Design a protein around this ligand. Structure first.
Ligand code: GAB
Length: 327
């Protein structure tokens, strides 16, 4: 069967911690006052929750209320514990309170207010400098959560809230996030199609923080090349074929050979034979001002089949692509 894998950084962060930190099942939720918050308008409804703009009437400050659909027990306590563990971290959305919603009878997470604009609204119109600036801000959030033993598992433009006027960013929606435990097998039904790493697409369960770095690479490629999404799969199978048309099939077969993965036979009729394309193939007159040799070298080091080979968040922050960003 498949060969095991371990994260190359922050491997044992949870192993050393007391069970209070990662044993989310045993966590006792401290309930706040639901009457402190007045719902103003519905912002959206996802598969697991309904999000509202609200006002905290105790300070007249705007907040965001996420009312969880009754789905699915353990998933609720996991999100709460992850949010509390990460509270105060750089560019991590701040959980202000947890109240019981009087109508749904489910937990309602109250977050600090962020502008009602996600990164998908802005990321195709940024300058070269702003792509570098906001990528560096996202990396601060990812290194913080990975250093805290947590993988986000749903990095995508909709999960980055941005206040462009104020040049501030927050990584949101920790509902798919999980504690990394070396040797643990995880569910591959995470992340959004276009941001799923090859490990998920080939059903390799012993993945780690590096999944978030593939998803970040997909966002970078979509920004510098002005191509939304970069890997445009029709379904989870064609998603891997779209990746293989760029990265090539030989390195895909080397990845599956290394981890002793048995590729779904559904792929024998659709994968074909593809050579790796040079990143310059995606440059054109409309995106050339966003592309530099440093951007392509950085992207190349994120978009790798082998999850163990990708840059970590901290190594990514060291890359020359960010030397122009003011720190
Ligand atoms: N829309 C919005 C704003 C803030 C947090 C969240 C979230 O799901 O964490 C969602």
């Amino acid at each position: 069967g498949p060969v095991p894998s371990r994260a190359r950084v922050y491997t044992d962060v949870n192993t050393h911690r007391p069970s209070e930190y990662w044993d989310y099942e045993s966590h006792v939720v401290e309930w706040g006052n639901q009457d402190d918050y007045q719902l103003v308008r519905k912002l959206g409804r996802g598969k697991y929750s309904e999000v509202f703009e609200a006002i905290n009437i105790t300070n007249n400050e705007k907040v965001v209320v996420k009312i969880l659909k009754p789905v699915a027990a353990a998933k609720i306590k996991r999100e709460i514990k992850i949010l509390e563990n990460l509270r105060g971290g750089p560019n991590i959305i701040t959980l202000a309170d947890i109240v019981k919603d009087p109508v749904s009878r489910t937990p309602a997470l109250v977050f600090e207010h962020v502008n009602n604009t996600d990164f998908k609204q802005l990321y195709q119109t940024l300058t070269d400098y702003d792509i570098r600036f906001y990528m560096y801000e996202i990396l601060k959030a990812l290194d913080y959560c990975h250093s805290m033993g947590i993988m986000h598992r749903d990095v995508k433009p909709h999960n980055v809230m941005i206040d462009h006027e104020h040049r501030k960013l927050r990584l949101i929606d920790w509902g798919l996030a999980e504690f990394y435990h070396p040797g643990q097998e995880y569910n591959v039904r995470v992340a959004s199609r276009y941001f799923k790493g090859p490990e998920l697409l080939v059903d390799y369960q012993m993945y780690d923080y590096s999944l978030d770095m593939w998803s970040l690479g997909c966002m970078l490629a979509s920004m510098i090349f002005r191509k939304e999404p970069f890997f445009h799969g029709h379904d989870n199978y064609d998603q891997l074929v779209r990746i293989a048309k760029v990265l090539g099939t030989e390195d895909l077969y080397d990845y599956i050979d290394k981890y002793n993965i048995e590729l779904d036979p559904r792929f024998n009729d659709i994968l074909g034979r593809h050579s790796r394309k040079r990143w310059e193939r995606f440059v054109h007159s409309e995106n050339q001002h966003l592309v530099s040799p440093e951007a392509l070298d950085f992207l190349d080091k994120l978009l790798r089949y082998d999850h163990q080979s990708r840059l970590t968040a901290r190594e990514a922050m060291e890359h020359p692509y960010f030397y122009t960003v003011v720190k």
